[model samples]
Target chain A: SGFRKMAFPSGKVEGCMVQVTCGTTTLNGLWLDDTVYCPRHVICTAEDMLNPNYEDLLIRKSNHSFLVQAGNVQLRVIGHSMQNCLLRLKVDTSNPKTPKYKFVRIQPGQTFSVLACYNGSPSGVYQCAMRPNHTIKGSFLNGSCGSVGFNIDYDCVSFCYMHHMELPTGVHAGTDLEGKFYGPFVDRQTAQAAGTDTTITLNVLAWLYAAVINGDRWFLNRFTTTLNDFNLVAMKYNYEPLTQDHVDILGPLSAQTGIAVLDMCAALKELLQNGMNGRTILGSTILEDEFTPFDVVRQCSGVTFQ
Target chain B: SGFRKMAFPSGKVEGCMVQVTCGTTTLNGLWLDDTVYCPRHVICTAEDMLNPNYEDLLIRKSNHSFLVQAGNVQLRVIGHSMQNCLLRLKVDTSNPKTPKYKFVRIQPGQTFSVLACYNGSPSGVYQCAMRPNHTIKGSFLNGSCGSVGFNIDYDCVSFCYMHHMELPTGVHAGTDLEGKFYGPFVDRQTAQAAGTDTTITLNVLAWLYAAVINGDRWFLNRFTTTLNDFNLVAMKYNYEPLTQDHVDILGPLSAQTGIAVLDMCAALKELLQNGMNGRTILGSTILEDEFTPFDVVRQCSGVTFQ
Candidate 1:
C-alpha cells in the first residue's frame, strides 16, 4: 500500500488565487495564505495518505473551501498570500481504483503548481464542485474562483473525492491504519469480539463532523445511532453504557452550527484515546452512573463555546 | 535420637594405645584425637538428632577406628596427639535400645582425658565394634569387638552403635531429620513421590565419603544405585540427571582415590542448586519455564562441601 509520490515547485509562490463553485453558483474569493485579509483560518496539505499526522491535519481543515485533486488533473488558484498557510500535493496509489486521485485542502497564501502525470494523454478533465454546508447552497465559501494550478488523474479515486472534493470521512481516516498500529495491543480474538462495535465508533466520529458543521435531524440521527452502536459494544464488556440523556442535546443543536461540533469532536477523541490505551476498564465501579468513559466525552463536550 | 555428651582430657595426650576388633583381625592404628589420643573431634554432645548440620558432620568422620559411647557404656582411646582432639564424655538420656553410643573423629595434636557417666550404677557395659564397609554382615554397624575403655549404664543408646559404629545411611540420615527441616519445602504429595528418592541421594552422599576413603565395590554399588534414585527424581522435573560416568570409576577406584569424587560432589551440588533456584526446566523453550515446588532433598542436597 505505497502512496504515489508527486513533486512540485520547491519554494513558496506568490500572486495565487482560488475559485470554488457547484453548478453556476460561485463562492467568495480569497487570497492564498492571506492571514490578515482572509479573516478565518485556512489549511492545505499535499502529503500522502499514510502520513501519521494526516488525521489531525484532515479534520482541522475539513470545513474550508478546498479542492482535493489527483496529480493528473489541474488546479488553478487566483490570489496573493501574505501569511504562511501551506498546501501540499501528492498522488495516492494504495487503492488501484483510485490510484491517480489524492485528497487535498486549500489555505490562505497556499499556491498550487500544476504538475500533471499525463500518461501521455488527458483522458479526463479535472473539474471542481461545491458541496452544501448548513442551509445555504454554499456555506464555507460564498463566492470563490481564483487561479490556482491543481490537477488530478482519473484512476483510483476515493468515493469521497468525487463528492465535492471533501476531506476523508472519519471511517476513511482511521480504519485502514488501526490494525497495523494497534494489532499488538489488541489481539485478533478480542478485536473480532468487539469488531462490530468499533464500526459504530468510527461512524460516530464521522457523523459528528457532519452534524456539528451542517446541523439537522439527518446528521443528528446518524450521530445518535452511531453512538448507540458504540454503547452496545461497550455493554458487552460490562463497560459503562451511554444513555440519550448524555447526548440528546446534540439532536436539538443540529439546527445550530459552529463550535458545538468541534467541542464534541475533542471530547469524543479523548474518550477514544482513553479506551484504546486500556486505562478505561469495565465492571470496576459499584455504581454505573457515577463515572464512565462516556463521562470523558461529556466533560469535553461540556465546555461551552459561543 | 539425642547424642550423649562426654568429656575427656583438655589437651593432647600420648603413649595411649587402644584396640577395637569386630571379631579378630587388627584394624589400622589412628591417632585418640585417633579416637583416644584425640578427643575433641569425639563429637559427643547431649543434643537431639534433629540438628541441622549433623547430616554433613556425621558422615564426614563416620570412620577412623572411633567408638560411639553412651552414659550406659564406656569407650577407650589409644595413642595421643600434641593437639587438642578432646573427646567429649557424657550420659545422653535420649534413647535406650542402644543406650550410650556416639560417633567420633580424629584431628592432629588432640588429647583425651578419661571421664565417666556412671549414672550412680553401671547398668550395662559400653561396647565398640567394627563392621565390614559393604554387605549385610554389618550393614550400618554390626559384629564383635575388642575395646580400649568400655563401660555403660544402659541409659540412651542407638541400636546402630551396638551393631557397629557405622555411618548413617540415606534413609537414616534424612528420615531422622526430614520432618524437622524439610516439612516446609514439601507439603505432602510431592514429598511422598520423592520420599524414597531423597533417601537414596542422602545415602549416596554419605557412602560417597566412605567409598572414596575406604575402596569397596559394595560401597560403590550402593553409591551407584543411590545416585540412580536421585537421578530418577531429578528427571521428573527435567533437571539435569546424573550419569554413572563420573561414578563408574569409583567401583575400580575403591582401591585408589582422586579428585574425581570431589569433582562429582561439586557437580551434583551445582545441579541441586540449579533445581532449587528453579533455573532448570523441561519442554519449555519459548518462555521461562515455571514449576510446582522444589523437593526438600534437592534443597538439602544443594549445599556444597568437601
Candidate 2:
C-alpha cells in the first residue's frame, strides 16, 4: 500500500496512515489542512468503511478512459487510468458540464487528469483544475516504455515566441510540456500573436518591503521602461488588474497578511504612517528578481535598476 | 488500492491518481505545493520507480512501535504499523533522540500520529508533529468493534483545564483525547495551574478591516480591562509579543498581504495613511471575537466592544 499509518492493524488492534496503493503509486499522508487524494477501488479506511455516512467514490475503468463521475464519499479525488499519470483537471459532480475547468487532459496515450467531483470538495478541488500560465513551465518527462516519466508535471505553459518564461531545467524550444524557451519580448505584437499579449506578468508573487514603497512607481516604471527598451509596447505590470490604489491593494493584502489581516486598521494605520525595517519573508525575492537589472533579464526581458 | 488515477491500467496505458491503498487505507493525490503522505512499500509511480535517485522509506513493523529510522526516498511520511493507523509524529533521520517531538502516541490500542523524519520533509511535516494546544481539542472514538470510526482526525490537544478551547463537536470533558470543557479563565492562577496560561488566544484568525484597525489597542485594552475585572491582574493581550508598533506589526502584515507583502511598503503606506473599508477576510472573526464585548467573554473573560 502507499500510505503511512500510526497504529497496528490485522489483529484486535487499530491504526492510522497517510496513504494506500492500487494500480500504481502510493498516496499522501494526513497532515493539517492537507488533502487526501484517493481513488474508488483503493479501499476506504476501516473507520470510514464502517460508518454509515462514510461515502467514497465508485470508479471503474472502461477502456482507456473513464467518464466524468461523482462519488458518495465526502472526500474527492482526481481520476486517472493509472494512479501516477496526472494532468490539469476541473470538476462538478452536480453539473459535470459547467465543470469548473472541464479541462481534461491525457498525454499522447498513457494518461491525463480528471476530477471525481463531489459537492463537498472545496476550493482546493477547483484549484485542482488546470489553470493556465504565462509561460511553458513544466518539465520534459521521458519514462520507461513500460514506464512513467511525466509521472505528473501539470501546469500551463504559453506558446509565446518572445516573452521571458521561467522554465524547467531541461526545457528548450521543445514538445508537449517541453519546449524551446522564448520571450522577454522585443515587441508585444509577435508575442501577442503567440497568444502572449501586451502584458507584464507578476505571476506567482511579489515580495515587497515598505521601504520599497519609495520605489513603487520607479519599480513599475523600470519594467515599463524595460518593456519599451525591449520593445513590448503597451504591455505593462501597472495596468489593469494590478493597481496603484493603496487601500485597494493594501486592503486585500492586509486582509491576507497578519497586519493586513490582524490589525483592524488603527495599528496597521500607524505601521503604515511609520515605516519598518528588517528582512521578513515578504518571501519577496521573487519580486526583486523580476524587476532587477536585465543582464539576467536582458538575457530575459531587459530592465534597469539604476 | 486507494487513489484515483487519470488513465486506464492493465494495458500499456499510463495513469495518474490521487491515492493508493495498502494494509488499511488509501493515500493522497498530486496537487501544486500540496504534500503526499506516503508510507514506505506502498508502491511508487512507474516514473518514480524508474528514477534512480528516487528514495522512499523502508518500514517493517518491529512489534507495535517502529523505531526511528532513515529513509532514502525523497518523499517522507508518518510511520505507523497500519496504513490507516495515522498519528502525530516527529522524525529526525540523523537524531531520533532530540527529535523535534518524540511525542509518540498509539491511542489506547489502535493508532495515533507519527512523523517519518527525512531531511527534505518541509514545514508540512514538522507541522505534522502533534503540537500541543491551549485546550484538549480532540474527539472521542466509538468505532464498530469490527471497525474504524475515527476515520482520521489528527491535531494537537491540551491538558489545559479552565482555559476555553475549541474542540471537536462530539468531545466532552472526559478521557483519552476526550475531556470535559474548561474555562474562559476569570483569573490567571487557576488558568495557569491547569497548564493554561494567563493569555488570550487569537488563534485561527481575525476578519478585520481598515475600519477595525482603530480597534487594535482598544481591542487589547478591552481584554486587559476584562482580565483585570476577572482578577487576572497582569494577564493581558496588550503586553508583549503582541505590539502596537505599526511597522513591526504592519511590516509583517503588509509583507504577508499586498500592502504587507506585495507592496514592499509604499502602496501599503498610502493605504495606511488613508483607511480602507469593506469586509476583507482579515479572515479575522477570531480576533474580534476575542476582544469584543465580554457578554461572551464575561462568560469567558469579559470585555467591552461598546
Candidate 3:
C-alpha cells in the first residue's frame, strides 16, 4: 500500500526497466545475462520528457523494467516485430475504486502510447509492462510498485470541461460527435455553429468511440442526453444555422458517421449486459440503425425516447 | 375550468381584459355606467404595456373590471389609501406542479406593480384580484373570475439563464442579486466574474431572496452549489483575475455579505426540517456559516460539500 521502489535494468542505474514477454521468438541479442540480451536496450538517464522518441526500436524479451518521468503525460514505446504485445500500465491505487490494470494493444513494431492527451495530476505513479497475451499473468514482473504524485490546478473553463460542468467541444466546436452520430443531428448543431467543420466532426466521432471503448463514464457523460438536451432549440420554431437546407448534406453525413456511433453504442450495451458497467455518451438507451434522419433530428430537438 | 372573457370599457374592441377589485373609495369619476357613476370605476382596455403611468389615479370603488393586454409581463395598479390590499395572481393550473397562487402587496397610492422586471414565459391564464387582507377571502369582487393569456419569447441568453443552463448577470452582469445576498458569496462567483458590479450584487441578492421566499426551486437550483460551483476558479495557480489582492476587499465584503448567505442557508435548512422539500443547488448538505472564506474559496475551486 505504501511506496515501493521499482527494479532497474541490469546496467541502468537510473532509468526504470520494462519487462516484456515474447510470444514465439526466442529472445537473443538484447541482454545483460544469457537469458537477457540488449536488442535495443540501453540504460540512459535523462530529464523528464513528456513523450519519448521511439525511432530505432527492437523486439524485447518479456519482463524488463524502465523508468519514466512522473510528470510526462505520455510515453512512446516501440515494438519492432509482428508479435502483438499487450502493454499494461499500473498506477498506485490511491483510492481502492481506481482501476487495477489498464491494458493497450501495441501492434507489431508500431509505436504505442497511453493517451494522446491527458489532463490529470502527475503525482500518481505508473508502472508499465508488456506481455504476449491479452490477460495479465500471475504477478507483475517487478515485486512491488512505487508512487509518483502531482498537483494539478486549472481555471474555470478548463476545470468545467475536465470535471463535466459543460459539454466538451467535439471534433466540431459545440457538437458532440457521439450525439451527432448516434443521438441526433441537432446535438451537433452547437458544435457545427461553433465552426466545427465536417472533418473535425469525424475526428470527434472517432475520439468519442475510443472513449466508449474504454468505458469512460466521465467522457461519456459529457454528451449524455440530460446535458446535451439542455440547450436544444428546435430548427423549425427558431431557425439556427443547421436547418432544412442542410439536410441534404447531413443525411449522407449521418449515413457516413452512423455506423461507428451505432457500433459503439451496441458494444457498450453488450458490455453492460455482460456485467460491465459502461454507459454511452448519450445516456443508457442506444439508438437503432433503422432510426430515420427525422427521428434523429426530433430527439435532437429535446424530445426523448423515454 | 372554462374560458371567461372580460368586459371591456366602451372604446376598446380587442385587448384581453382584467377584472379589477376596487377598495372602499366610491366610484366618482372614471367611467360610463350610472350605477358605476365614479369615473374611476370605468372598465379600460389597452395593449399589454409593461407598466402603466400612475399620476392621475382615481379612487375606485369595491370592484370594477379593467383591461390589460395579454402579452405584457407586468401590470400597473392604483392604490389611494392604507388598504394593505393583497394582490393575488393565479394562473390556470395547466400543470398540477405549477404554483397555485402568487401574491404581492400594494401600499396606498405608491407605484405598485407585480414585478419591477420579469423574464419568464407568460403562457397560462393569470387571474388577478385584490383581497382586503392577506388571506384570499370568499369570492373575488366579480361574480366571475377572469383569464388573461399572454405569449412571450426571448432570445438566447435570457432564456438560458431563466432556465438554469447559464448564470444570470447582475448589477455589473450575470451575478444574481438574491444569491449574493442570501446563499453564498461562493455562489455568486460566476456572475461576479461576468462583470456584476457591487450595486447589482445587492439587486441580484434581492432577486435571489424573492425566489427563496417564494420557494421557487427552479430559480434556486440555478445557482445550486453543484451547479454554481461548476465553473468557479480562484486567483493564482491558473489566474483568471480574482486575485490574491482582491482577498482583502473580499474579506470585508464577506463580512457585509456573510450574514445573508449564512442566514439564508439556515432558513433553507429550517424549511427542510419543517417538511419543506427545498434542495441545495448542488444536491448535498448545505454549507455552514462557520466555514471559512477559504472553505468557500475551495468549493469555488470545484470542491463540493457532498
Candidate 4:
C-alpha cells in the first residue's frame, strides 16, 4: 500500500520552479514532479461568473461645493461622507417644484467637469429626486436614509434611471432588486428659485467658475462676452424663499458644481432664448474667491440705472 | 489535558475536536479555541454594473409594420463573445456621423436585415458593420456566411473589421502601436464598385432598416420626406447603388438570419426623419414572427446592436 498526493511549493505554490530529487527514496528518481502541475486545456466557455453588467442610475451629479458647465442643467456631489449621505438628482425639470434644481453640494473630492450641451433636460423632462437631506447621523437608517422621485416622463425615464429604479429610498438608493422607485422631493428648492430669474445668477455662477477653473470653448466665449458686458437688476427683493439664494447664485455653474448638465441646459437655453444679458455671479472672479460670496446683504430698493 | 476546536457550518475548522473518551481512555475536556463562521455581510456598487434606462426599439407605421408609438430606445446585446462578437452603439448622434448604416445579410438565422435610405454611399456618416461567417459547422451558426460594410466616412473613419480595435491585430493592413490603418468602407459589395456617388444608399439603408426593423420616426420622416420626396428622375438614378437591383428587391427579407444592431439604429433615425411612409420589409408579418421591437433603439444604441 503506497499513497502520495501531498504538495507544497513552499506553502502556496512558489514560481519558476524545478526540483529534482534523487534522494527522498524511490518516487522514481523524481526528476520534476513539482507537485503543482496543471496542463490540460480545451474548455469552451465554462462560466462560473462573468454575468455582471446591470447598472442603472441614469444620472447622479452629487454636487461638490460648486462649478458645473458642460451643457449645464446640473447635478453634482460625490465623495464626502463622514457616512450617512445620499443626494442623487438628475432632475432637468418638468417640475421638481418649478424652475429646476433640487439639491447639490460638493467638495469631498472634486473633478467632474463635463459641458458638451444639449441632450435631454428642458423639454427632455428629467426628474429623479430624493434629497430632502436624507438623514445624517441622526439614526433611523433601515433602508439607509430616504428620498426618491421620478419623471423623464415619456422616455421610460432614462430606463427608469438605467434600472436602479429611478430613486427609491436614497442616500443614492440601489441594492438592486431591479432599482428605480423615485419618491421624495415634494418641494426641493422651488426649481432652484426659478433659475434666479434668468441672469442665471452671476453668469451661471461665473459659468460654473469658468467650467471648473477654465471650462473652455475659450472660457465659454469669454464668459459669454463677460456676460454681455453687464446690466441685470434684482439687486435685492425677498418674499423669503429665494431657494437658498438661487443656490448661492446659480449653484456654482451647473451639472452639479461648476457647470455641465449640458452647460446648464445651454445656460438655461441662453436665458430662455436671449433676454437677461448681464454680469453677475457677483461679477465673476469667482465672487472674490476663498469663500464668503452670499449670506445676505440686501439694502437697495432704489438704485436703478440700467 | 484538553484539546477542542471543531466549528464548521461550511466554514470548516476542526483543529482538534475536544478530547475526552472513557473507552479509549483519552481526556482533554476543555480548551476549544476556533473560529470558522461564514456570511460576512456583503457590499457592492458601481451602480451594480450599468443599464437602468432605455428599453424597447421597434416602431413604424403607414407603409406597414404598424405600432408607431413607443420609442425610448433601450436596445441590448453586450459581449463575452459566443464567437467573434462585440457590438455597442449608444447613439444620440450630437453630430457623430448623423443618420447612417447599411448591414444586410437577410436570411439564415432567419431573415436578418439592415437598410435605411440616405447618404447613398461614399461617406454620409452614421455607422454599421457586420460579419459572422467563419464557416460555422460544429458551432451552430447558420447565418449564410456573413459580410456587410458601410463607412465611407462617418465617425469620419476607423476600420479593419471583425471587432476592429482599441488594440486588436488580426491583420489586413490593420496593424497598430500607431502604424498601418486603412479603414472606412471597402465592403458594402466593394464600396459601390469603387466608383462613388451617393443616393445616401437607399436613404442611409432605409434610416439603418427602420433602426433594425421599424422606429426612427418613420425612417426619420421617410428621410426628411424622401429629401422632400425629391424629383428630377429619382435624383437621376442616384438611389440605386445597393446593387444586384438593391439585393433583388430587398432579398426576400431573408426568411430570418442576421440584422438587429437595435433594429439597425430604429430603421437609420425612421429613414432620417420620415421618407419610407409606404413601408417595406420583405416577407414581413414582423419578419415571420420572430418579432423585434423596442425603441429609441436600445438606449440610443448602447448594448451595441447585436
Of the candidates shown, which would achieve the greatest TM-score relative to the real structure?
4
The top-ranked prediction according to lDDT is: 1
Candidate order, TM-score descending: 4, 2, 3, 1
Q: Of the true interface contacts, what fraction does each candidate have?
A: 0.00, 0.00, 0.00, 0.00
Comparison by TM-score, 1 against 2, better one? 2
> Which is superior by TM-score, 2 or 4?
4
Tens-digit lDDT track of model 4 for A162-250: 11111221123221112222233221112211111112243233333332332123223313322222222222221112234444454
Global fold similarity of model 4 (TM-score): 0.22
**TM-scores for all candidates?**
0.13, 0.20, 0.18, 0.22
DockQ of each: 0.00, 0.02, 0.01, 0.01
Q: Provide a comma-separated list of chain B TM-scores, one per candidate.
A: 0.18, 0.22, 0.18, 0.19
Q: Which 10-residue window in model 4 chain A sums to the lowest lDDT? A: A1-10
**lDDT by residue for model 2 (A1-306), tens:** 011111111100001012323334233211111222222323333334333221222243322232222222222334332222112122222222111111122211121111111121110000011112233222111110011111111222111111121222212111121112222211111223223222222221122322122122222111112222222211233211322332343443333332331122222222223323322222221122122111111111111111
Cα lDDT tens digits for candidate 4, B85-194: 21121211122212232222222111111111111111001121121121111110111011111222221212222211111111111111111122332211121211
**First chain of model 4: TM-score?**
0.17
Q: Which residue runs of candidate 1 sit more than 4 Å off their true CA positions?
A: A1-306, B1-197, B201-234, B237-245, B250-306
Task: Give the C-alpha interface root-mean-square deviation per candidate.
Answer: 47.7, 22.4, 35.4, 32.9
Please give the CA lDDT of all the candidate structures: 0.25, 0.21, 0.21, 0.21
Docking class of 1: incorrect
Off by over 4 Å in 2: A1-101, A104-133, A143-206, A209-250, A254-306, B1-306
